[PDB]
Amino acid sequence: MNLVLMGLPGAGKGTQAEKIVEAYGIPHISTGDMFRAAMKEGTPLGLQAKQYMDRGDLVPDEVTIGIVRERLGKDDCERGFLLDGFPRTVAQAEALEEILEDIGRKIDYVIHIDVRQDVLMERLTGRRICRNCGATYHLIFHPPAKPGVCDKCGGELYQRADDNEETVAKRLEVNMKQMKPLLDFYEQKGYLRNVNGEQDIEKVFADVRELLGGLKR
Numbered sequence: 005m006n007l008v009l010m011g012l013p014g015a016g017k018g019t020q021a022e023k024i025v026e027a028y029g030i031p032h033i034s035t036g037d038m039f040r041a042a043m044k045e046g047t048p049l050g051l052q053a054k055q056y057m058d059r060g061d062l063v064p065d066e067v068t069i070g071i072v073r074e075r076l077g078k079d080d081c082e083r084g085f086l087l088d089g090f091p092r093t094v095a096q097a098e099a100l101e102e103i104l105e106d107i108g109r110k111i112d113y114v115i116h117i118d119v120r121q122d123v124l125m126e127r128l129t130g131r132r133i134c135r136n137c138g139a140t141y142h143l144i145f146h147p148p149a150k151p152g153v154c155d156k157c158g159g160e161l162y163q164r165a166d167d168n169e170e171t172v173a174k175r176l177e178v179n180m181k182q183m184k185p186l187l188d189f190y191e192q193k194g195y196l197r198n199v200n201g202e203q204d205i206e207k208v209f210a211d212v213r214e215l216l217g218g219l220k221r
């Protein structure tokens with residue numbers, strides 16, 4: 005399974021990626037996760053990315069493409085992979101085609117989790133994640149068994165810096181501008197498939213398993 009997840013900030017991509025990885029054993033590759041880990045470590049790329057992420061802007065194309073090229077060339081990607089929130093621009097998608105031609109690992113399907121913008125502010129301001137393993141919760145929609153504690157590793161939950169009302173409105177504007185050109189790129193390829201993201205979390209995952217059932221595991 006060679007897969008991409010696309011969708012607006014807060015649509016449910018991370019939530020569904022956790023369930024796909026647990027079921028099928030393929031590597032989870034999230035560019036947002038990679039940039040936040042680098043920022044916490046204080047590396048030159050992490051400090052560059054921080055200026056863009058704090059505002060709600062996208063990180064420039066070529067440095068982003070470069071970290072993806074290197075990750076996908078690893079041995080653990082031989083029998084499949086899941087890209088979560090990359091690509092984000094048509095220039096990223098064009099580069100990704102050339103990378104996969106070269107290593108012989110072409111995309112099976114692009115999964116678009118479709119959610120309208122009027123519900124996304126409430127999704128993002130109540131999001132809480134695990135400091136140690138990244139597991140995703142929501143104080144109203146999907147709370148942990150014990151308050152402030154991860155169900156998976158027992159670590160402390162926290163609110164991301166970028167999940168504030170002012171930075172969320174900027175993220176929605178920036179990412180919406182890229183949606184129609186990216187969706188048109190993959191529709192013309194023939195392997196874009198749509199999922200209704202405005203359902204219960206377990207029903208969204210059911211529809212995702214139904215999409216993926218024709219692939220070898």
Ligand SMILES: Nc1ncnc2c1ncn2[C@@H]1O[C@H](COP(=O)(O)OP(=O)(O)OP(=O)(O)OP(=O)(O)OP(=O)(O)OC[C@H]2O[C@@H](n3cnc4c(N)ncnc43)[C@H](O)[C@@H]2O)[C@@H](O)[C@H]1O
Nearest residue numbers: 013014015016017018019035036057063089131141142145
């Ligand atoms: N390729 C690239 N190019 C350039 N720059 C890049 C880049 N990638 C990253 N960057 C930079 O890095 C930053 C961060 O990137 P990114 O982290 O990828 O954050 P985002 O891009 O803003 O996407 P999120 O990770 O925000 O949302 P999600 O769809 O995964 O939803 P979730 O499952 O958590 O769910 C949301 C909430 O709702 C809940 N929820 C999930 N599903 C449902 C449901 N069905 N019903 C109710 N609630 C639900 C969850 O519990 C959760 O609390 C960017 O702004 C940019 O600066």
Ligand SMILES: [Mg+2]
Nearest residue numbers: 018034036089
């Ligand atoms: Mg994510």
Ligand SMILES: [Zn+2]
Nearest residue numbers: 134137154157
């Ligand atoms: Zn955890």
